[PDB]
Structures are given as C-alpha cells and as structure tokens.
Write a protein that binds this ligand. Structure first.
Ligand SMILES: [Cl-]
Length: 151
C-alpha cells in the first residue's frame, strides 16, 4: 500500500535522532525488513501491513513534536498509549530478527560481509537494551562499517 509513508518518516526520525546523515544503506535495509515482516506471514499480511500504518502515523506525529532524544520519543509513545508503545517495540525487535533470519540476504542487499551483518544485529540488540531502538543502533553501526571499508 502507501506504507512507504512509514519508511519515509521512519528514516527521517531515525537519522535525526542518531546524529547521522541520511544513508542509502539504511533505507535499503529498512525496506528489506518491512518486506520481510510482510512475507513472514502471508496468512496475516494485511494485519502486519496495517500495524505499519498505525506506526507510520506515530512517527509522523513524532516529527511534529519537540523530540530531540530517544527518551523524548519514548515519552511521546507513552502519551500515545500502549498500542503504539508495543507497536514500535514489536517492529524494532523484528528488525533484529529479520537480520538474523536471513544474514546472507542482508549481506546481498547491502554488499557487506556476513561479519558486518552480525555487527548490525549486535548493534541493534544493544540499542534496544539502551532504550534507543534497533534502527538507531543499526544506523550508527552502518557508518562505522562504511568507514572501515570505504575510507
Ligand atoms: Cl537514512
């Protein structure tokens, strides 16, 4: 559907909160994750895709508020209610699961080694534990990987 609204505002908030410039690799990985969550259950595809619609609305509203840190965003989720809080934390954990569920595909799309794909999953896991969400962790780790290889 028009859940490219989600991918737009998601990328927009994530790179802002991360402190990073926009990154085509993150965008590509983000699209791969959202597609993996849609194909993971064809018997419940539209149920999955509308969880994104409710999240694409959540990140859109987030961009309308004064949110400078993950803690602000976490507070905005609570003001939104448990549907949205669980919604983000479900997606952010699925982000890590998708990477682990097909590391060679991630390696393919991003043209990186499998060891660097493990860095992405690891970076996402640690950012979830810090309360920042996996997307921010993965955004920042993608910069290091680019620097070690490109530079
Ligand atoms: Cl980005």
């Amino acid at each position: 559907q028009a859940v490219e609204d989600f991918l737009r505002v998601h990328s927009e908030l994530v790179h802002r909160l991360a402190g990073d410039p926009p990154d085509e690799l993150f965008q590509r990985l983000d699209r791969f994750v959202t597609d993996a969550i849609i194909e993971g259950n064809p018997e419940r595809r539209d149920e999955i895709k509308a969880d994104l619609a409710r999240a694409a609305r959540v990140f859109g509203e987030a961009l309308e508020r004064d949110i400078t840190t993950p803690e602000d965003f976490n507070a905005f989720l609570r003001e939104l209610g448990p549907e949205a809080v669980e919604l983000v934390s479900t997606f952010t954990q699925q982000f890590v699961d998708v990477i682990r569920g097909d590391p060679q595909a991630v390696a393919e799309h991003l043209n990186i080694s499998l060891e660097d794909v493990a860095r992405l999953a690891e970076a996402g896991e640690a950012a979830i534990e810090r309360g920042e969400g996996a997307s921010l962790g993965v955004h920042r780790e993608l910069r290091r990987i680019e620097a070690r290889r490109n530079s």
